[PDB]
Amino acid sequence: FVNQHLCGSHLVEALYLVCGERGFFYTPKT
Protein backbone atom coordinates (compact mmCIF):
# COMPACT_ATOMS: atom_id res chain seq x y z
CA PHE A 1 0.00 0.00 0.00
CA VAL A 2 0.96 3.62 -0.52
CA ASN A 3 0.99 6.56 1.84
CA GLN A 4 -2.06 8.76 2.02
CA HIS A 5 -2.87 12.45 2.14
CA LEU A 6 -6.43 12.62 3.50
CA CYS A 7 -8.49 15.57 4.69
CA GLY A 8 -12.07 15.91 5.84
CA SER A 9 -14.51 13.36 4.53
CA HIS A 10 -11.75 11.56 2.55
CA LEU A 11 -10.23 10.39 5.84
CA VAL A 12 -13.57 8.89 6.88
CA GLU A 13 -13.87 7.07 3.55
CA ALA A 14 -10.41 5.59 4.08
CA LEU A 15 -11.23 4.45 7.61
CA TYR A 16 -14.40 2.83 6.27
CA LEU A 17 -12.45 0.88 3.61
CA VAL A 18 -9.68 -0.12 5.96
CA CYS A 19 -11.85 -1.27 8.89
CA GLY A 20 -14.86 -2.73 7.08
CA GLU A 21 -17.24 -4.59 9.36
CA ARG A 22 -15.01 -4.00 12.37
CA GLY A 23 -16.12 -0.36 12.28
CA PHE A 24 -13.93 2.46 13.55
CA PHE A 25 -13.80 5.62 15.60
CA TYR A 26 -13.23 9.01 14.08
CA THR A 27 -11.68 11.28 16.71
CA PRO A 28 -10.36 14.68 15.49
CA LYS A 29 -8.65 17.18 17.76
CA THR A 30 -10.79 19.82 19.46
Partner 1 sequence: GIVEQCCTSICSLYQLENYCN
Q: How many residues bind to a second copy according to rule CB under 8 A?
A: 28
By CB under 8 A, is residue 9 in contact with partner 1?
A: no
Burial of 15 (0-12, 13-18, 19+ CB in 10 A): middle
Helix (H) or strand (E) holding 14: helix 9-19
Distance CA 26, CA 12 (A): 7
* Minimum CB–partner distance for residue 27 and a second copy (Å): 4
* Residues contributing to the site for partner 1 (CB under 8 A): 1-8, 11, 14-15, 17-19, 22-30
* Residues contributing to the site for a second copy (CB under 8 A): 1-6, 8-10, 12-30
